[PDB]
Amino acid sequence: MSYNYVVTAQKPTAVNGCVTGHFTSAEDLNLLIAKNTRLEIYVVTAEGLRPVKEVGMYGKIAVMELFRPKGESKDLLFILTAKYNACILEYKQSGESIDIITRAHGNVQDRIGRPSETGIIGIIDPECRMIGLRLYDGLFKVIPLDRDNKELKAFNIRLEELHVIDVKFLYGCQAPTICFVYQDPQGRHVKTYEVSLREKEFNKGPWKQENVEAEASMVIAVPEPFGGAIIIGQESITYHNGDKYLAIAPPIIKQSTIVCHNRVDPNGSRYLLGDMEGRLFMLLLEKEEQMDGTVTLKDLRVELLGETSIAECLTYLDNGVVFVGSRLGDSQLVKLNVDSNEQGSYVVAMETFTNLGPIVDMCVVDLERQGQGQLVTCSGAFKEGSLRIIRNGIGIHEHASIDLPGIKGLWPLRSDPNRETDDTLVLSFVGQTRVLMLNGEEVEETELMGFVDDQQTFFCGNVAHQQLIQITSASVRLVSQEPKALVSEWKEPQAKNISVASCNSSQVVVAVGRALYYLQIHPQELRQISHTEMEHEVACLDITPGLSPLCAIGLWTDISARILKLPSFELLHKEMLGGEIIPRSILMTTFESSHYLLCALGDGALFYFGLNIETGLLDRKKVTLGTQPTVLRTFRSLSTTNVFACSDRPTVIYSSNHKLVFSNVNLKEVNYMCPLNSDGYPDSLALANNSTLTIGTIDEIQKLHIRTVPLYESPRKICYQEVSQCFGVLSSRIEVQDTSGGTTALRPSASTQALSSSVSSSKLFSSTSFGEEVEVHNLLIIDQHTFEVLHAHQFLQNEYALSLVSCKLGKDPNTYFIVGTAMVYPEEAEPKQGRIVVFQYSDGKLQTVAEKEVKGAVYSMVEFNGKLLASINSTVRLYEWTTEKELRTHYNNIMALYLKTKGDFILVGDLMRSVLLLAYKPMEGNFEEIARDFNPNWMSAVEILDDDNFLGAENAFNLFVCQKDSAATTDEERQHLQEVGLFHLGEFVNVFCHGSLVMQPTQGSVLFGTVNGMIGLVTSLSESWYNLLLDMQNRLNKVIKSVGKIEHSFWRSFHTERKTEPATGFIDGDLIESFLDISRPKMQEVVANLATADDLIKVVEELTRIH
Amino acid sequence: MADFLKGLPVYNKSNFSRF
């Protein structure tokens, strides 16, 4: 009876792999970026990186390589899932759309191998003879490459070399030959083998086995003109080819291990290298063209180019530009320049890509303060460590406000020698109209003086021929920019009112009852051109430039999207979309390389269409925004700008990949709006509602607005303290032993350039190498508005902070920052000494209140019921805040890393392996072990849904829920709890916490962050929702196409090295929200028995507004 | 001025000159 639900709140942003090649067409420079379950394809264009198609697989991309075999049109992509799903792909844009055909596929797991240190390796032959795998120790797998092997078949060779580091296929050999670095006793070596796919055996390799560096970590396939292999160790870079052998050992390298490499030239004369310190080297193979026209290679030279961010992938694109794929921090784009312009860095940043990095910890705050919170995470490691403030939805920041009561229109107006800055704002009430005169921000209105007084203005703009028009319920009126007086007016033939109004720079389309009149703006005159009465009564008009071929309309009778020319009123189309309530707003504008038609029903729904303008032919989809007539309007932030959707749920339609973005606005309700670039509020927007008249600015192009706070060090834990109006963050930096026997700063990080910056000097202990890297932990008092390191309190040497708490204890009025540490000596791996320290941020100082000496590692701790629950090594103590402010102490026996508290005296502890359930009783101060879990799990996170639902996540990228068993005898069968939920996420969860990003039928909300920068939400479903969506899952696998032909069943299965179970009690909207992206024949194959399309399309539309 | 930065690969020149 545990029915949960997981959605992606943010795609994984870390970059794990990136390759270059010709994938779309021939000479189509593609950049293929691997995130986790996502695959991104780009085309190098003048613009920069422009994508073609972002696909999504049911697996964790572990091997990604490109190649086109003998006689192929374009390169064939190859991908291997970490769960051992192989597939060859092919970009095929034969039609106007894009489809990734799956030429081949096949699972290549071995029932009898052990995954090896340094993980999976996927190598491909230089001439596309075979794919080579190194999944398990001592087993090299071969997959021959022909055409009939479409069901990817494979066979294993045996590898006498047991511990293998890195393998590569050598260029220019008589047949497939392999070069690798393997380890055994007596250091590690490099051996050569020949793969013989005719006898399925290993043959003695081209050259002798050499001894190499002890820490050789990478092998580089050197191209044809030179041939050989380059081996990158920690301190010596060596070149091996037969008897030839070169090697250079620059001390410039040892400081950090080289991690990645990328080939620059096709010749291989130049290579790019990357440090964990964030460097970027250029490895050189200098040439020596001899007498006999041949080329040879003479020496190696490595010289530093500068520093990028810490790179896990590396890739030269084109024109001296390199894409830096960062896993610990922001991926970026980099230009390498011959002239080192500034300092010594030949490296210049061009673009950075938001990477939420390894999310170590996070917390939810109401920084905006309605109901919608913002996530503040601890992203990145080392120099790329930052804080990320995920704000959800387009937001504004108001600059002024005026108590108005019920406006019915907003219009900018310019009434002066044109300064290019609007100086007049004109409002309209149900009848009365008041032309606000605002040289500054004034209230007092002077009707700039011909505009109508109490008749309720429908349009008020700046028409061409340097004049100013006003459409109202009396007449259209032209006030001039020559004497500034009423010079022209179009009364009505029957002398009756105007209903609809539509005006641009030089045209005017008005409507009376059923009639449609056309007017053209000329100096001091209003000219009549067209004239027609429609079939039905006019409800809404739109014209869009100062001359429009088309004129869109909405009628009062049949909800007819009708398009008309203007020099006459010839009908060009009508749509079969008849509702029952009137269309209220209509608009047509240009977003990107297209022309869309928009229409707003009175019920709250909106349609969008596409078309050109040489014929009136037009993409029905009932997108629902608010519940009240949504008044549309175009607005102008930059030049390429979008439309504003005034409603009680203000949406904004931006341009995506030349499609639709629908981002809510963090305001309660808006009825009317218009842009404003004023000589007093420049580039502001005027927002009207039923109350105030705000004025402010705008933020973002899509949903999230991610604020960044660079820390330049590693942030570990985070808390929020409202009484101090500031955050609390624990963080560690790296320091290397100097020539003096102490440490040093690598780079000026945040803790070292803090405002206060105190230290410790606490004698609590009484019972030292050189050239090392030591950690130094601090407590950062980040401020919550002007993120800055107010205070940075430093701990003792060899003391690592591991837990952070911001709470009140006992009946003490003060709110404290409680920090629990652990003494780490670089020798014995389970700490024996620790500390729990209680601080207070009084004003500008960080007082040390109390200090309970502790012997053990304080892994985690949480406020419990005014008591300080703490986890020390294998003991779970319950402390208590003494009136003397001493925190006196109360027992279990278990290694708790993670610790949560529902309340009600019930606890959650993890990790001797599995989960436990403990209860406190006002009885003895001691806990009772209610019911634990026995099947083991190497876990990494914990959370509570309710009293009988406990969320787990373990080192294996799976989720699972525990629940107290209800079996026969409560004597023991209750003393256990089973796993009513199993689920494979593919992400490495680090932290669970409660809250929702949206301001908020389905119960619950738990957010989690992951190493790949992915953010997800967990909810709960009644037994009528779970069984609806469960059968909606087991019917969507049949009607959705998998990129690798990987059955969704297999992807979600609980996978470990031991129990491979099916999923239960879990539902992923990432597989169910996609149901809104299919055709109706398919979409109605899932919904037939047990219910139609319009009864799921708009039900799921509620299930996307949970995150 | 770097020696080893003269003449980076150029597959197309109008390929990256907008930014």
Q: Which residues of A touch B14 (CB under 8 A)?
A: 46
Q: Are residues A1026 and A1014 in the same domain?
A: no
Residues of B in contact with A46 (CB under 8 A): 14-18
- Select the residue from B4, B6, B13, B19 to test the A interface by mutation, using most A Cβ atoms within 10 A: B4
Inter-chain contact A319–B19, Cβ cutoff 8 Å?
no
Nearest chain A residue to B16, by CA: A46
d(CA A841, CA A837): 13
CA distances from A823 to A699, A757, A836, A937 (A): 45, 22, 11, 27
User: What tokens does A990 get?
Assistant: 């680090």
Whether the CB-CB separation of A703 and A393 falls below 8 Å is answered with yes
Query: Which backbone phi and psi does A216 adopt, to 5 degrees?
Result: -60, 125
Mutate to test the interface with B, among A27, A267, A318, A343 (most CBs of B within 10 A): A318
Which stretch of DSSP H or E encloses residue A1027? helix A1023-1033
Please state, in angstroms and rounded to a whole number, the distance separating the CA atoms of residues A324 and A986.
24
Cα separation of A76 and A102, whole Å?
10
Cα–Cα distance measured from residue A748 to residue A848, given in angstroms and rounded to the nearest whole number: 26
User: 């043959």: which residue's tokens?
Assistant: A203
The number of beta carbons lying within 10 Å of the beta carbon of residue A714 is 23
- Quick one: A322 and A383 in the same domain? no
In chain B, residues with a C-beta closer than 8 Å to the C-beta of A340 are 1-2
Torsion angle of the four alpha carbons A114, A115, A117, A122, in this order, in degrees rounded to the nearest 10: 130
Please name every residue paired with A304 in a beta bridge, in sequence order, or none if there are none: A281
B8–A320 CB contact, under 8 Å: yes
Structural domain containing residue A1036? 1022-1107
Report the candidate in A695, A738, A740, A732 with the shortest Cα–Cα distance to residue A716.
A732
Same domain, residue pair A443 and A501: yes
Rounded-to-integer distance, Cα A863 and Cα A559, Å: 59
What is the rounded CA–CA span in Å between residue A901 and residue A908? Answer: 6
Are A656 and A708 part of one and the same domain? Answer: no
Residue A485: count other Cβ atoms within 10 Å of its Cβ. 11
Give the containing element (helix H, strand E) for A983. Answer: strand A977-984
Both structure tokens of A521: 């703006």
Q: Are residues A1009 and A954 in the same domain?
A: yes
Closest CA to A78 of A57, A93, A63: A63
Helix (H, G, I), strand (E, B) or coil at A1100: helix
Count of C-beta atoms within a 10 Å radius of residue A538: 23
A126: left (phi over 0), alpha (psi -120 to 50) or beta: alpha
Instruction: Kindly state the DSSP code that residue A1103 receives in the 8-state scheme.
Output: H
What was the elucidation method? X-ray
Q: Closest CB to A264: pick one of B8, B17, B19.
A: B8
Residue A265 and residue A295: Cα distance in Å, rounded? 15
The answer for A 28-67 residues in CB contact with B (under 8 A) is 29, 44-48
Residue A995 near residue A1007, CB atoms below 8 Å: yes
User: Do residues A612 and A583 share a domain?
Assistant: yes
CB contact under 8 A, B11 and A270: no
Contact between A892 and A875 (Cβ < 8 Å): yes
Please give the span between the terminal C-alpha atoms of chain B, in angstroms, as a whole number. Answer: 24
User: Using alpha carbons only, what angle is made at residue A404 by residues A398 and A410, rounded to the nearest 5 degrees?
Assistant: 70
Distance from CA of A264 to the nearest CA of B (A): 7
State how far residue A656 is from chain B, nearest Cα, in angstroms.
19
Output A810-815 pairs: Cβ under 8 A, ≥24 positions apart: A810/A866, A810/A867, A810/A880, A810/A881, A810/A882, A810/A883, A811/A866, A812/A881, A812/A885, A814/A840, A814/A849, A815/A721, A815/A722, A815/A723, A815/A724, A815/A840
Q: Give dist(CA A30, CA A22) in Å, integer.
A: 6
Please indicate, yes or no, whether residues A852 and A876 belong to a single structural domain of this protein.
Answer: yes
Residues 183-222 of A with CB under 8 A from B: none
**Cβ of A305 under 8 Å from any chain B Cβ?**
yes
- Residues 1-19 in B contacting A (C-alpha not used; CB under 8 Å): 1-2, 4-6, 8-19
**Residues A873, A924: one domain?**
yes
Task: Please tell me what DSSP assigns to residue A267.
Answer: S
Candidates A228, A231, A208; CA nearest to A218 is A231
Tell me the structure's resolution in angstroms, rounded to a single decimal: 3.1
Query: Does residue A680 contact residue A438 with C-beta atoms inside 8 Å?
Result: yes
Report the SS3 class of residue A119: coil
Where would I find the beta strands (DSSP E) of A773-863? Answer: 773-782, 789-794, 799-807, 816-823, 834-841, 846-854, 858-863
Comparing alpha-carbon positions, the chain B residue that sits nearest to A30 is: B15
* Cα–Cα distance, A501 to A510 (Å, whole number): 5
- Final residue in a domain of this structure, among A1021, A1045, A1069: A1021
Task: Find how far residue A15's CA is from the centre of its chain.
Answer: 12
Domain end (from A1003, A1021, A1039): A1021
Q: Which residue has the tokens 């560096």?
A: A213
Residues of chain A with C-beta less than 8 angstroms from the C-beta of B17 = 46, 319
A418 and A310 in one domain?
no
Tokens for A822, please give them.
């652990």
Say if residues A539 and A554 touch (Cβ distance below 8 Å): yes
Question: DSSP letters of A770-781?
Answer: SS-EEEEEEEEE
Q: Does A349 touch chain B (CB under 8 A)?
A: no
Q: What are the CB-based long-range contacts (under 8 Å, 24+) for A784-787?
A: A784/A365, A784/A367, A784/A720, A784/A725, A784/A726, A784/A727, A785/A725, A787/A387, A787/A709
- Indicate the length of chain B as a whole number: 19
Are residues A247 and A312 both part of a single domain? yes
- Dist. CA A557–CA A576, nearest whole Å: 12
Length of chain A: 1107
Residue A120 has a CB neighbour count (10 Å cut-off) of: 16
- Which residues of chain B have a CB within 8 Å of the CB of A351? 19
Contacts with B4 from chain A: Cβ below 8 Å: 270, 282, 284, 301, 303
| DSSP symbols for A1034-1083 | TTTSSSS--TT---HHHHHSB--SS--BPPBS--BTTTTTGGGGS-HHHH
**Interface touch A27/B15, C-beta < 8 Å:** no
Query: Facing residues of A85 across strands?
Result: A107
Q: Is A577:A607 a contact under the CB 8 Å cutoff? A: yes
Shared domain check, A583 and A443: yes
What are the DSSP calls for A438-453, one per residue? -SSS---B---TTS-S
> Quick one: A324 and A371 in the same domain?
no
Q: Which of A969, A992, A1021 is the endpoint of a domain? A: A1021
Residues B8, A46: C-beta atoms closer than 8 Å: no
Q: How many domains does chain A have?
A: 4
Please, what is the end-to-end C-alpha distance for chain A in angstroms?
24
